[PDB]
C-alpha cells in the first residue's frame, strides 16, 4: 500500500503545515500537524473542555461506528515550545491520503494549552517520530507510520514541504519526480526517539563551507532552524543591522536587509536554504524589525532542523530496520 496527501501552510509565514486526515466511520476529516518530532496522534474532540476550543474541527468518537475506548489509557504531552495537551484514548480507523490503518490510537484531548486553542487552523497533531516517545499509559501506542509500516510497499515516508506553498507527505514510496539530483542518505540515532542525525557542516551565503559535525533532529513540527550559537552568530553577522534581541527572543533584522542563503551538509552533499526562507516577517504588525528564521538552539538542549531547513529539501524518513534519513535538492 501507499498514501499521498497534500500538506498546506497554515499562514503566510509557513508557521506550520496541516494535512487532512480521515478518522472514524463515517470519516471525520481533521486537519493535523504532521510532526516528525513527536509520537502522539491527538485531536481536539467532543471531550475537549469547551472553553479551550475556538474554531477547531473536533473528533466525536460517539459518532464513529469503529471507535472503541482504549479502556484505562491516558496521555499527556508537553512540547518544546511550552505547549501541552492531555486526555484519554480511542482506537479507530485512520486514513491519510488513501492509506488506511485500523486500530490506530487516537488520543482525545480533554485539555489543551492556550497556544493550541488560539490556533484555529490546527485540529491536532500526528506524530511521526519513533513510537518509544509515545505518551500513552499504561500501554504505549504506535504511531500511524509504525502501524502502517508492514503494509507499505516500502517502509518509508517522505516530507516535501513547500515554501509559501503546499507540499506533500507520501507513505510507502519515493516519488522520483519530486526532487533533482540524487538522494543522499545519512545515519540516524533513535536513542532519544527522534530522527536524529549529524550534519557535516555549513556555509553562509557564498562563503566557504565549514566542515563540522552538527547533531540535530529532523522535525517537521518545528517552524525554524535552531543551531549552535556559533553557527547562528556567523550567519547573522553577514546581515546588515541584524542583532539578537532578548526582548523579542532571538535574532531580528531590518526588513531592508538582504538575507544570504544558508547551506547545510548531508554527507558530502549540500542543501541550500535560500535567503528568502529565513525571513519570518515583522515582529509585530507595522514593525521594521523582522524575525529571523535561523535561531540559536542554546538552552533547547538539541539542534533542530525544522521547517526552514526541511522545506529546502525532499526528505526521506526511512523506517527500515536500521533507520536512515535521505535529503535531496528539489
DSSP string, 243-270: EEETTTTEEEEETTSPPPPEEEEETTEE
Q: 83 and 153, same structural domain? A: yes
Whether residue 148 has a cis bond before it, omega within 30° of 0: no
Q: 209 and 160, same structural domain? A: no
Backbone angles phi, psi at 231, to 5 degrees: -60, -50
Structural domain count of the chain: 2
| Strands 262-266, 303-305: pairing kind | unpaired
Catalytic residue among 35, 40, 119, 219: 35
Of 291, 287, 288, residue with least CA distance to 277: 291
Q: Which residues pair with 318 in a beta bridge?
A: 156, 324
CA distance linking residue 243 with residue 238, whole number of Å = 11
Three cell numbers at 236? 547573522
Helices (H), ranges, the chain: 114-117, 144-148, 229-236, 307-310
Backbone angles phi, psi at 119, to 5 degrees: -105, 95
Q: 56 and 23, same structural domain? A: yes
Catalytic residue among 64, 199, 296, 297: 199
**Taking the alpha carbons of 259, 265, 266, 268 in that order, is the dihedral positive or negative?**
positive
Q: 129 and 222, same structural domain? A: no
Query: Could you say which DSSP state residue 137 is in?
Result: B
3-state DSSP assignment of residue 126: strand
Q: 165 and 193, same structural domain? A: no
Backbone angles phi, psi at 47, to 5 degrees: -95, -10
Residue 155: partners with Cβ closer than 8 Å, 6 or more residues away: 149, 172, 318, 319, 320
- Resolution, expressed in angstroms to one decimal: 1.5
Can you say whether residue 47 is alpha, beta or left, with left for phi > 0 and alpha for psi between -120 and 50 degrees?
Answer: alpha
Backbone angles phi, psi at 232, to 5 degrees: -65, -40
Q: 107 and 21, same structural domain? A: yes
The last residue of a domain, from among 138, 156, 174: 174
CB 121, CB 34: distance < 8 Å = no
Q: 170 and 197, same structural domain? A: no
What was the experiment behind these coordinates?
X-ray
Q: 291 and 279, same structural domain? A: yes
Q: CA dihedral defined by 242, 228, 77, 278, rounded to 10 degrees?
A: 40
CATH number of the domain at 124, please: 2.40.70.10
Query: Could you say which DSSP state residue 47 is in?
Result: T
Per residue, what are the HEC states of the chain? CCEEEEEEECCCCCCCEEEEEEECCCCEEEEEEEECCCCCEEECECCCCHHHCCCCCCECHHHCCCCEEEEEEEEEEECCCCCEEEEEEEEEEEEECCEEEEEEEEEEEEEECHHHHCCCCCCEEEECCCHHHCCCECCCCCCHHHHHHHHCCCCEEEEECCCCCCEEEEECCCCCCCCCCCCEEEECECCCCCCEEEEEEEEECCCCCEEEEEEEEECCCCCCEEECHHHHHHHHCCCCCCEEECCCCEEEEECCCCCCCEEEEECCEEEEECHHHHEEEECCCCCCEEEECEEECCCCCCEEECHHHHCCCEEEEECCCCCEEEEECC
Q: 187 and 170, same structural domain? A: no
Q: What's the domain range around 256?
A: 175-330
Residue 129: partners with Cβ closer than 8 Å, 6 or more residues away: 35, 36, 37, 38, 39, 143, 193, 194, 195
The last residue of a domain, from among 174, 190, 209: 174
Alpha carbon of 189 to those of 15, 79, 114, 202, 224: distances in Å? 27, 20, 33, 21, 22
Three cell numbers at 161? 514541504
Active site residue 211: no
CA distance linking residue 123 with residue 295, whole number of Å = 27
CB 290, CB 279: distance < 8 Å = yes
Q: 292 and 182, same structural domain? A: yes
CA distance linking residue 65 with residue 251, whole number of Å = 50
The last residue of a domain, from among 140, 157, 174: 174
CB 197, CB 189: distance < 8 Å = yes
Q: 98 and 23, same structural domain? A: yes
CA distance linking residue 90 with residue 138, whole number of Å = 14
CA distance linking residue 185 with residue 322, whole number of Å = 12
Q: 133 and 69, same structural domain? A: yes
Active site residue 146: no
Which residue reads 558530502 in cell numbers? 268
CA distance linking residue 106 with residue 94, whole number of Å = 8
Amino acid at each position: 500500500s501507499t498514501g499521498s496527501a497534500t500538506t498546506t501552510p497554515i499562514d503566510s509565514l509557513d508557521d506550520a503545515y496541516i494535512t487532512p486526515v480521515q478518522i472514524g466511520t463515517p470519516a471525520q476529516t481533521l486537519n493535523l500537524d504532521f510532526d516528525t518530532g513527536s509520537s502522539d496522534l491527538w485531536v481536539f474532540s467532543s471531550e475537549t473542555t469547551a472553553s479551550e476550543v475556538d474554531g477547531q474541527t473536533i473528533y466525536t468518537p460517539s459518532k464513529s461506528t469503529t471507535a472503541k475506548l482504549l479502556s484505562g489509557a491516558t496521555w499527556s504531552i508537553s512540547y518544546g515550545d511550552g505547549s501541552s495537551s492531555s486526555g484519554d484514548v480511542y482506537t479507530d480507523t485512520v486514513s491519510v491520503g488513501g492509506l488506511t490503518v485500523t486500530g490506530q490510537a487516537v488520543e482525545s484531548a480533554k485539555k489543551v494549552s492556550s497556544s493550541f486553542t488560539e490556533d484555529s487552523t490546527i485540529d491536532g497533531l500526528l506524530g511521526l517520530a519513533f513510537s518509544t516517545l509515545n505518551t500513552v499509559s499504561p500501554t504505549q501506542q504506535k504511531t500511524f507510520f509504525d502501524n502502517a509500516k508492514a503494509s507499505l510497499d516500502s517502509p518509508v515516508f517522505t516530507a516535501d514541504l513547500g515554501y509559501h506553498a503546499p507540499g506533500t507527505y507520501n507513505f510507502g514510496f519515493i516519488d522520483t519526480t519530486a526532487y533533482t539530483g540524487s538522494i543522499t542518505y545519512t545515519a540516524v540515532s533513535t536513542k532519544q526517539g527522534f530522527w536524529e542525525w549529524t550534519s557535516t557542516g555549513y556555509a553562509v551565503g557564498s562563503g566557504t563551507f565549514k566542515s563540522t559535525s552538527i547533531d540535530g533532529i529532523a522535525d517537521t513540527g518545528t517552524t525554524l532552524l535552531y543551531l549552535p550559537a556559533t553557527v547562528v552568530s556567523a550567519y547573522w553577522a553577514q546581515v546588515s543591522g541584524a542583532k539578537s534581541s532578548s526582548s523579542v527572543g532571538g535574532y531580528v533584522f531590518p526588513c531592508s536587509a538582504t538575507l544570504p542563503s544558508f547551506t547545510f551538509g548531508v554527507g558530502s552533499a549540500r542543501i541550500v536554504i535560500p535567503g528568502d526562507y529565513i525571513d519570518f516577517g515583522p515582529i509585530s504588525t507595522g514593525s521594521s524589525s523582522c524575525f529571523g528564521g535561523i535561531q540559536s538552539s542554546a538552552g533547547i538542549g538539541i539542534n533542530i532542523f525544522g521547517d526552514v531547513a526541511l522545506k529546502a529539501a525532499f526528505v526521506v524518513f526511512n523506517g527500515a530496520t536500521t533507520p536512515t534519513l535521505g535529503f535531496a535538492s528539489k
